[PDB]
């Protein structure tokens, strides 16, 4: 029986300050009881002043983010390099995620 | 020169659909067929057109057909176009029976067919049916009913109608003698008493006919549908005005 999912540990955190915001996340990456790398980032700038991190199953994470960033790219292409309002961003991420409602991305994402 | 009759998909400056009109013109080239309503039955009479000395005609038929066990039709126009319809007309008729577990009402069947003929008049790459039909049947909704339909896709209910060749004549004669209550054996009378007058042949020979009727009463609480045999004809034909 082929099981398409895996858990690469990790933890991320996001606090919203009065006029700034942070998003942290350790660098360790694991598989069962072993180590795969002591430094493998899980927090990226996606452009338009927006940080994002998807934590859970390594691969689904990388996928979502890549898929999100390629999306910011096209939002500019179609609306005159207009800036992506972070609220407009989350609404968009919803659709990305719900896109796979019946073969879900095994991750907890945070922008 | 330049005319607006090149196809069905084209309105002439005056909103005419020539291609359809020409099909309606193909009918006047068919053997005369008649249908007469009666207080107790319906009569279908036709006059085989095609002819030759060696042409089998005592077995097979060409103008009268059974669609339902309670509905019959007279054909007139393109032979092949007639079968294509007649068949689907039969399938539809059976689906109604298979769904409602009741027999299909006449007008419904005539309407379904007229609705297909309608369609071949509005879509490109299609040629309208070069057929005309006289439907004679009975249902518990409106007793006996006589209907007619042409290539244009319109249909209507007559008390006595004729289609085919010399419709003007046949139509005229009827318009005259038809007594509104007229019994069946008087319609079968009037059938020939009209077909005769509008023929050509030195004499009206039996082998050149097709009769069928629909009767019912208290007896068989239902309808009996008969398609006369070469025999009965050659006979009832003499009983009238032929040696």
């Amino acid at each position: 029986q082929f099981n398409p999912y895996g858990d690469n540990g990790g933890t991320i955190l996001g606090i919203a300050g009065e006029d700034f915001a942070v998003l942290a996340g350790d660098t360790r990456n694991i598989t069962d009881y072993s180590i795969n790398s002591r430094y493998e980032p899980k927090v990226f700038d996606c452009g338009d002043n927006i940080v994002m991190s998807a934590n859970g199953f390594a691969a689904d994470g990388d996928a979502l983010v890549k898929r999100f960033k390629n999306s910011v790219k096209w939002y500019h292409f179609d609306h005159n390099d207009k800036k992506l309002s972070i609220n407009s961003a989350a609404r968009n991420i919803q659709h990305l995620l719900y896109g796979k409602r019946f073969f879900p991305y095994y991750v907890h994402t945070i922008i | 020169s330049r005319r607006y009759d090149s196809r069905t998909t084209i309105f002439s400056p005056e909103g005419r659909l020539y291609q359809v009109e020409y099909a309606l013109e193909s009918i006047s080239h068919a053997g005369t067929a008649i249908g007469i309503m009666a207080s107790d039955g319906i009569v279908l009479a036709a006059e085989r057109k095609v002819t030759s000395t060696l042409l089998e005609q005592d077995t097979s038929t060409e103008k009268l057909y059974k669609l339902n066990d309670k509905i019959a039709v007279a054909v007139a126009g393109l032979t092949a176009d007639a079968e294509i319809l007649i068949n689907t007309a039969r399938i539809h008729a059976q689906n109604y029976l298979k769904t409602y577990n009741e027999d299909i009402p006449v007008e419904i069947l005539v309407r379904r067919l007229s609705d297909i003929k309608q369609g071949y008049t509005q879509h490109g790459g299609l040629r309208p049916f070069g057929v005309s039909f006289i439907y004679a049947g009975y249902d518990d909704r409106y007793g006996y009913q006589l209907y007619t339909s042409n290539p244009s896709g319109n249909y209507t209910g007559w008390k006595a109608i004729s289609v085919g060749a010399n419709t003007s004549a046949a139509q005229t004669l009827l318009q005259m003698d038809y007594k509104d209550d007229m019994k069946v054996d008087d319609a079968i009378e009037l059938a020939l008493k009209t077909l005769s007058k509008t023929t050509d042949s030195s004499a009206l020979t039996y082998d050149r006919l097709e009769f069928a009727t629909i009767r019912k009463g208290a007896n068989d609480g239902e309808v009996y549908q008969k398609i006369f045999k070469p025999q009965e004809i050659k006979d009832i034909l003499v009983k009238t005005g032929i040696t």
């Binding site: - | 090149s6 196809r7 193909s26 009918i27 060696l54 042409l55 089998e56 092949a80 299609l126």
Partner: protein, 249 residues
Amino acid sequence: TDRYSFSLTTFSPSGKLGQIDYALTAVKQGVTSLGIKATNGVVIATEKKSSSPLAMSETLSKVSLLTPDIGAVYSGMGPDYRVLVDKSRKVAHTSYKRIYGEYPPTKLLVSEVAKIMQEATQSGGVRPFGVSLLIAGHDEFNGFSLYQVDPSGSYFPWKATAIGKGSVAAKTFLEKRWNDELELEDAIHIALLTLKESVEGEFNGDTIELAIIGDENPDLLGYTGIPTDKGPRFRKLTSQEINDRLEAL
């Protein structure tokens, strides 16, 4: 020329589809062929013409077996007939034998074939078949039968008739010497004397292809043990059986 005879989809002002009649012309041109219904049989025949004697005519049939109780012939465009045939022998299984465990009656095969003939018409983008066939056979409940099928898709039943170049008269000859009684041997006769005038070539055993529907051949099966499976009624006469009946005129 009209401006209406170049479209299957077009009605002339009177009401005549055009392309059909010109198709029906290629037929009224083809080599003469006839069919006679007897009382205990039916005969279908058509002539043969050689491009050159360097060609083997005994590898190209003209009288074909559709079902072991039905055969058919033609007059018009050669090539059409060849495949119109194989499509007929199939629509005979897929449409009847495979649903009712038995072969089809004459009437319905002729109509299943006119059905394929119909398609060629109703539809621009294709041309109708330039052939007209005489199909002859017999089925239990209907006795023997004779039918004609034209590109127009229509089809009729005769007692006797001919189609082709020399038909006007051949169809005149027959008209005279036909009556409800002719036994099969008589028909086979009356046929040759009509396939006679309708030729400019010769009258041997090869240039004549004739077959007939008659009695069952308990020999032509290949097996024996099952009572009801008795045999095929269709018999295509051989080059020999012929010229013998030619000597006795």
